Design a protein around this ligand. Structure first.
Ligand SMILES: CCCCCCCCCCCCCCCCCC(=O)OC[C@H](COP(=O)([O-])OCC(O)COP(=O)([O-])OC[C@@H](COC(=O)CCCCCCCCCCCCCCCCC)OC(=O)CCCCCCCCCCCCCCCCC)OC(=O)CCCCCCCCCCCCCCCCC
Ligand SMILES: CCCCCCCCCCCCCCCCCC(=O)OC[C@H](COP(=O)([O-])OCC[N+](C)(C)C)OC(=O)CCCCCCCCCCCCCCCCC
Ligand SMILES: CCCCCCCCCCCCCCCCCC(=O)OC[C@H](COP(=O)([O-])OCC[N+](C)(C)C)OC(=O)CCCCCCCCCCCCCCCCC
Ligand SMILES: CCCCCCCCCCCCCCCCCCCC(=O)O[C@H](COC(=O)CCCCCCCCCCCCCC)COP(=O)(O)OCCN
Ligand SMILES: CCCCCCCCCCCCCCCCCCCC(=O)O[C@H](COC(=O)CCCCCCCCCCCCCC)COP(=O)(O)OCCN
Ligand code: HEC
Ligand code: HEM
Ligand code: HEM
Ligand SMILES: CCCCCCCCCCCCO[C@@H]1O[C@H](CO)[C@@H](O[C@H]2O[C@H](CO)[C@@H](O)[C@H](O)[C@H]2O)[C@H](O)[C@H]1O
Ligand SMILES: CCCCCCCCCCCCO[C@@H]1O[C@H](CO)[C@@H](O[C@H]2O[C@H](CO)[C@@H](O)[C@H](O)[C@H]2O)[C@H](O)[C@H]1O
Ligand code: FES
Lengths: 124, 111, 244, 54, 61, 71, 383, 85, 55
């Protein structure tokens, strides 16, 4: 599925007061049990990147963000092979779990989806 | 009693059916039968049920006298044949095939 | 299915050969051959066993040649092309009691006594099933069992009605080694013999397995040291990150 | 112990020669040792134990 | 945390006698034992397995 | 004489007494039922196989080891 | 430039077994690939050896297998090795497919190796089924009968095709000789597909248990995974040894030690254990043709995993709900296996149907639902 | 999507210093006892529910099914068997 | 492959199997053609120096 779809659906949920009241607490617990923060990842580090769209979005990251992403992946890979978890400053705190990549991929996809639409336009 | 004669490697069930067996077979309403047939259509002689004793589902040979309709039960997928050798329950689509058999004498048949 | 239709499942008896490091008791094998020869061979063939197979298992070369030479086997035709018999040789297979299936069935009220070369592998239970079946004919069938004619009640046989009658009774065999030939003793011996017949490599197989287990365990232990050794640079890797 | 390394381990030709010679020794001695062990745990059971009667 | 000349702590893993011949020789004893059992195991496997091609017992009779 | 006979009898009277009595009571019922007429023209003819199996299974559990120990 | 890189042939070896860049965090479930290659090699070596002693003619086949067991030097070992390794091959292949499903190895960009893999899986099943028939014991014959008669379900031409497969009117000598020839061949076809799925994989490289890129941190295949693969090789050989030397018939059916008898049908005909889940799926559908389609669909449905998994994240390491669903799917697959070998009796009839429904609903309903929901939970959860 | 050594297709890396020591300098089994006990307990504890829940459920289901099946083919279960067929 | 049956199995292919005669003759004759072509191929390679560097 596309990040666009995920983001739009999430916005529908966060709009509805009822829905957010029941979904926000569930999603927070889900993320706590997911446990990616225990390897020092940010959520966005997990998104599948072997697609042309995602390769483009990653290329559009500011250099600093990009270098730090590489570090978090290397660090996490080393935790994985060691079967250790992050400790102390290596654990991602909820306040550091920023959606650094979502704006870039949303823009890449927006143009690719516009392109698909416009390839199908019919002069009226 | 039910005999097993090999004919083209396939087993041939020959049952010497009793009077009351014939009666039991003639009962079931033809309506409710995957393959609708009466015994009369199957046998040319009510006392000689001659069938190709291979199950019409996948091709096991039903264990005779066993079943739930007390004729033949295919152990493989649990399809039950009758005293006519008609399918009653289980995956089997058709009744047990009848070969081309003729009574040359009244005491000998050829297949 | 009903328990009857399955057959009662035999007890687990402590056979000498049960146990990763245990061979057959060859003295028992020899006794069991004598039970086969004096009781079972009347109805049951042992077609996959040759006289040579007994040699250095149950009998010396001489004893086995003597058993072979007492029988007559089909030779190649003579010079006028007439059929001939010869005395048996070690390469000959132990001959069966019947010329064909039809003769076998006719002698046993329609039942066909199976060849026993593989019966220990061909039934769930193996030795235990053979022992349970031979010793498990009750004096009287449980009240309410209807046996088909020519059948005998035996709970271990699936369906309960077996075409083989009880055949082992105290002192049907006189063992040549002075062991008391009780029903249980003879059943144990013949069951062991038939188990050997089904898997004659048994003793050698388990010895080679012991060698394999030892060496494979050692290689596994060493391979773990070596893996850990070679991987330690990767496991022990440390990073220092200074964002640029 | 330097000396041991230098003679048997430093050259791979030497190390492989040593490994194969050791494999030869191991193979022969292990065979003999298992044979004896197997005969002791299966004592009086094997044909070699009853052969003497015949 | 910042200086890259301050090597991270490896003391939990470093052997004190790391440059001795005894030290190397030990690891090669492990490697060599493994090679020795692999050689003996391979020879046993090959020998037993190929013997299938020598005359079977019925042919020897 | 056959060691099994004694061991089986001992195991029936001892650890498998409940099952012995069940089989016995079963036999009594079935024989009585066979004694009565129009038994042959009954739908369901009760047997004692189940109780027999329970008894034999029990005897075998308490005897197997003992029997093979004395052969 | 170093020889291993210069020379075209050596460089192909080099690219796959030596300099091949692997993720540095592959766990032990990445070792089944090499164990399956080891099984394949053992099966080829033992199988070709059996072929030197086996006779494919139905009058001699069963006896030739007894001759291997009794007369050929180490014949017992070669036969048991071949038969047991067939079982280990399936344990490892299920493990490997399990690894691939759990860690999302089927997602882009690895749909092609996954899809070729599903074909390898079909070929393994066919290879193993034909090999089983070659013994020509009771299970051999009756298994062949049942399974080849499934083709009778094909409408209009079904019957004709079955007689064409058999080379006759029943399973007999013609069938056995053709199964010999095909059983010999099929492993070579299987090896080609195994190699193709590797070549297809080599464009993306292996996945890793985190499901992130490994482009940032690679390790040479040798020595690291070479030595790590040795550990599981010795673990496998220990399990192999315990079966082959100490319990060689634990995984077999006793009825296969009785010579094939077309008259007597055995008490229970079950396939080999590794086919049992598909057998249970077939029994669940009452219709003949329905059952066959369901059985085939249970394998071919794997091909749609790339589509029905809607997740923005590769694999289950970080997805608690997906992990629970996966656990239930796997346990259901084992339940199906067990229901494949029970008697067709209540209450296992209804149970078999429910397990079959659960099997298919994983692909068609639950995985698409769950993966969509988890996408949302990751996004909202990390805001 | 993946290159080869020298052009693997990593985004540019900068600013990570990696350190490691020789395999001959390290104790391969350092802290093995602590790992085998504490680390394995931690890893097992965190995964236990995902195994226990489906295993326990399907084992319970099988147990109920096998027990009912056994009971239906007793004398006592004659009537219930007749209805089930 | 059994020596008691091998020759006869080849006769069975010639006489009984549908198109067996063709399949057997095709197999036997193509063995000859295989060698003609392989000698031709090697002859080509020798005459045209296909064996020299870099081949
Ligand atoms: C067949 C042929 C024989 C050859 C053997 C090959 C098998 C090797 C293999 O792949 O499994 C070993 C494998 C060890 O692999 P690893 O590289 O340590 O970790 C892989 C996982 O990430 C390990 O997951 P983790 O890091 O989350 O640790 C979990 C594991 C603890 O893992 C261990 O270290 C054991 O504990 C469990 O999940 C046990 C379940 C609890 C129920 C009680 O053990 C398991 O993972 C068992 C759990 C499977 C369910
Ligand atoms: C299956 C066949 C088993 C063959 C292995 C037997 C002998 C080879 C061996 O142990 O390799 C050690 C050797 C040496 O291991 P090494 O390469 O770590 O040692 C080299 C460094 N010195 C010489 C100083 C010790 O490995 C090889 O030569 C590779 C051949 C393996 C096959
Ligand atoms: C039996 C039920 C298995 C459920 C597995 C649930 C996950 C778990 O606990 O496993 C441990 C581990 C968990 O590993 P992980 O990679 O998720 O987590 C590692 C540690 N963290 C999360 C901190 C990064 O899972 C595996 O390794 C799963 C491999 C699946 C193999 C399945 C074979 C079945 C064959 C059926 C084929 C059709
Ligand atoms: C092909 C099938 C592969 C499976 C191999 C596992 C065991 C088979 C070996 C045969 C065997 O019984 O050997 C035993 C020892 O096992 C062992 O010690 C062998 C286990 C060693 C593991 C395998 C290591 C290499 C094997 C594969 C390499 C083959 C090709 C490379 C050159 C005892 O037999 P024995 O000791 O009496 O034998 C005479 C020499 N004394
Ligand atoms: C089965 C038998 C196991 C293999 C025996 C190999 C001998 C082991 C000792 C020799 C050794 O460690 O030396 C290395 C040889 O290993 C090697 O070169 C091979 C490494 C491991 C071989 C196995 C690879 C994967 C196994 C899984 C099978 C794959 C599936 C196909 C069936 C050299 O290498 P180094 O770089 O450590 O030397 C460092 C300096 N020169
Ligand atoms: C005079 C006849 C006769 C003698 C003596 C005899 N058997 Fe049998 N046996 C049979 C017949 C007939 C069957 C077939 C029973 C059936 O299928 O109903 C049979 C069946 C068997 C079976 C297989 C039962 C099965 O599961 O199919 C075994 C094992 C067996 N016999 C072993 C022995 C042993 C051991 C002895 C003596 C030590 C023995 N038999 C003596 C006639 C005999
Ligand atoms: C003969 C059978 C097979 C062999 C020998 C084989 C071998 C391998 C090997 C060596 C690898 C690379 C290392 C590894 O990940 O374990 C691999 C990867 C893979 N195999 Fe298989 N395989 C076989 C069957 C299958 C089947 C049946 C499937 C799928 C249904 C499959 C799908 C894959 C996939 C998707 C990968 C990439 C997984 C990854 O590394 O993330 N393979 N296989
Ligand atoms: C993937 C590879 C293979 C698999 C999975 C496989 C599987 C099997 C199986 C399951 C059997 C039945 C075993 C038994 O119960 O006795 C068998 C028998 C046989 N296989 Fe294979 N096999 C494979 C490769 C080969 C190859 C390459 C040959 C080469 C001819 C071969 C030759 C035989 C022979 C001759 C038999 C009959 C003798 C016997 O049963 O042991 N196999 N195979
Ligand atoms: C390139 C490789 C070089 C050529 C390889 C040579 C192939 C065959 C060589 C030996 C084959 C037969 O050689 C023979 O092997 C078997 C083991 O298999 C040994 O036999 C030994 O063990 C077996 C079981 O393991 C027993 O049945 C036997 O009683 C015992 O003597 C013989 O002592 C040896 O003489
Ligand atoms: C697994 C058993 C071992 C034998 C090897 C397996 C046989 C399959 C090999 C033939 C398939 C083609 O394999 C293909 O070859 C070339 C070079 O060899 C590889 O090419 C790769 O390596 C070379 C250098 O190592 C580079 O020039 C290139 O940039 C890189 O992509 C491909 O990534 C691989 O896909
Ligand atoms: S084979 Fe006859 S019921 Fe399926």
């Amino acid at each position: 599925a596309s990040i666009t779809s995920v983001v739009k659906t999430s916005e529908l949920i966060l709009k509805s007061p009822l829905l957010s009241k029941i979904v926000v607490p569930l999603a927070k617990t889900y993320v706590k049990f997911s446990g990616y923060r225990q390897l020092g990842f940010k959520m966005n580090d997990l998104i599948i990147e072997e697609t042309p769209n995602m390769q483009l979005a990653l290329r559009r990251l500011p250099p600093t963000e990009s270098y730090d992403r590489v570090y978090r992946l290397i660090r996490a890979t080393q935790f994985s092979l060691s079967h250790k978890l992050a400790t102390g400053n290596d654990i991602t705190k909820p306040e550091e779990d920023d959606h650094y990549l979502i704006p870039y991929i949303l823009d890449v996809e927006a143009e690719a989806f516009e392109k698909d639409a416009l390839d199908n336009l019919e002069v009226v | 009693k039910n005999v097993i004669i090999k004919w083209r490697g396939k087993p041939i069930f020959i049952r010497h059916r009793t009077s009351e067996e014939i009666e039991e077979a003639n009962e079931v309403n033809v309506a409710t039968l995957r393959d609708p047939q009466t015994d009369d259509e199957r046998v040319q002689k009510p006392e000689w049920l001659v069938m190709i004793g291979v199950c019409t589902h996948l091709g096991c040979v039903p264990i005779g006298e066993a079943g739930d309709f007390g004729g033949w039960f295919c152990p493989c997928h649990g399809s039950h044949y009758d005293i006519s050798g008609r399918i009653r329950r289980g995956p089997a689509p058709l009744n047990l095939e009848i070969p081309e058999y003729d009574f040359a004498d009244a005491e000998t048949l050829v297949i | 299915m009903t328990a009857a239709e399955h057959g009662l499942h035999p007890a687990e008896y402590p056979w000498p050969q049960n146990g990763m490091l245990s061979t057959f008791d060859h003295a028992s094998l020899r006794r069991g051959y004598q039970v086969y020869k004096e009781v079972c061979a009347a109805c049951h063939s042992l077609d996959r066993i040759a006289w040579r197979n007994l040699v250095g298992v149950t009998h010396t070369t001489d004893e086995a040649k003597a058993f072979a030479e007492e029988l007559e086997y089909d030779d190649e035709p003579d010079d006028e092309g007439n059929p001939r018999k010869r005395p048996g040789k070690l390469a000959d297979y132990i001959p069966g009691p019947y010329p064909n299936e039809q003769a076998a069935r006719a002698a046993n009220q329609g039942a066909l006594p199976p060849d026993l070369s593989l019966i220990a592998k061909a039934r769930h239970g193996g030795a235990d099933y053979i022992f349970a079946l031979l010793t498990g004919y009750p004096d009287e069938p449980p009240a309410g069992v209807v046996l088909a004619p020519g059948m005998n009640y035996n709970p271990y046989f699936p369906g309960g009605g077996i075409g083989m009658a009880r055949t082992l009774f105290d002192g049907v065999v006189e063992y040549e080694d002075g062991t008391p030939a009780t029903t249980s003793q003879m059943a144990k011996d013949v069951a062991a013999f038939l188990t050997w017949a089904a898997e004659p490599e048994h003793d050698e197989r388990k010895k080679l397995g012991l060698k394999a287990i030892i060496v494979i365990s050692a290689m596994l232990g060493l391979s773990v040291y070596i893996k850990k050794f070679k991987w330690s640079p990767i496991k022990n890797r440390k990073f220092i990150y200074n964002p640029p | 112990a330097t000396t041991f390394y230098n003679v048997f381990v430093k050259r791979n030709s030497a190390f492989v020669a040593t490994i194969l010679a050791s494999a030869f020794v191991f193979d022969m001695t292990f065979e003999t040792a298992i044979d004896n062990f197997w005969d002791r745990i299966n004592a009086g059971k094997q044909w070699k134990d009853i052969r003497h009667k015949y | 945390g910042k200086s890259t000349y301050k090597i991270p702590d490896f003391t939990p893993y470093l052997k004190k006698d790391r440059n001795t011949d005894a030290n190397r020789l030990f690891s090669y004893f492990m490697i060599g034992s493994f090679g020795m059992l692999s050689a003996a195991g391979a020879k046993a496997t090959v020998q037993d397995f190929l013997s299938n091609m020598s005359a079977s017992a019925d042919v020897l009779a | 004489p056959d060691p099994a006979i004694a061991l089986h009898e001992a195991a029936a009277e001892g650890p498998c007494h409940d099952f012995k009595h069940h089989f016995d009571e079963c036999v009594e019922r079935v024989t009585k039922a066979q004694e009565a007429e129009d038994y042959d023209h009954a739908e369901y003819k009760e047997d004692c196989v189940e109780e027999f199996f329970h008894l034999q299974h029990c005897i075998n559990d308490n005897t197997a080891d003992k029997l093979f120990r004395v052969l | 430039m170093a020889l291993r890189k210069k020379n075209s042939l050596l460089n192909m070896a080099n690219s796959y077994v030596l300099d091949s860049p692997q993720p540095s965090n592959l766990n032990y479930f990445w070792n089944f690939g090499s164990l399956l290659a080891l099984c394949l090699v053992i099966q080829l070596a033992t199988g070709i050896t059996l072929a030197m002693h086996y006779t494919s003619h139905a009058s001699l086949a069963f006896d030739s297998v007894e001759h291997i067991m009794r007369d050929v030097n180490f014949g017992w070992f070669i036969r048991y090795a071949h038969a047991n390794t067939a079982s280990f091959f399936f344990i490892c292949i299920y493990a490997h497919m399990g690894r691939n499903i759990y860690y999302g190895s089927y997602k882009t960009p690895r749909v092609l190796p996954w899809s070729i893999g599903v074909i390898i899986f079909l070929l393994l099943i066919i290879t193993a089924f034909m090999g089983y028939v070659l013994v020509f014991g009771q299970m051999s014959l009756w298994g062949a009968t049942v399974i080849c008669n499934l083709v009778s379900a094909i409408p209009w031409l079904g019957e004709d095709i079955v007689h064409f497969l058999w080379g006759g009117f029943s399973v007999g000598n013609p069938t056995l000789q053709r199964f010999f020839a095909l059983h010999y061949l099929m492993p070579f076809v299987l090896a080609v597909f195994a190699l193709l799925h590797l070549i297809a994989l080599h464009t993306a490289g292996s996945s890793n248990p985190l499901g992130i890129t490994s482009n940032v941190d690679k390790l040479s295949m040798h020595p690291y995974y070479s030595f790590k693969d040795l550990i599981t090789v010795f673990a496998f050989l220990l399990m192999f040894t315990l079966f082959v030397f100490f319990s060689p018939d634990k995984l077999g059916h006793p009825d296969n030690y009785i010579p094939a008898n077309p008259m007597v049908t055995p008490a229970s005909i079950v396939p080999e254990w590794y086919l049992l889940p598909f057998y249970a799926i077939l029994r669940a559908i009452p219709d003949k043709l329905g059952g066959v389609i369901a059985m085939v669909a249970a394998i071919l449905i794997l091909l749609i995993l790339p589509i029905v998994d809607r997740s923005i994240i590769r694999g289950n390491a970080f997805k608690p709900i997906s992990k629970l669903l996966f656990g239930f799917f796997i346990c259901n697959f084992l339940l199906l296996g067990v229901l494949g070998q029970v008697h067709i009796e209540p209450p296992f009839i209804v149970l078999g149907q429910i397990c079959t429904i659960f099997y298919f609903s994983y692909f068609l309903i639950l995985l698409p639902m769950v993966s969509t929901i988890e996408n949302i939970f990751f996004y909202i959860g990390s805001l | 999507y993946m290159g080869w050594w020298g052009h693997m297709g990593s985004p540019p890396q900068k600013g990570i210093a990696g350190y490691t020591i020789s395999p001959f300098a390290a104790r391969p089994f350092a802290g093995v006892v602590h790992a085998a006990i504490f680390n394995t307990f931690r890893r097992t504890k965190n995964q236990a529910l995902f195994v226990i829940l489906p295993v326990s459920f399907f084992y319970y289901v099988w147990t109920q099914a096998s027990e009912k099946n056994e009971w239906l083919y007793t004398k006592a279960g004659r009537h219930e068997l007749a209805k089930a067929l």
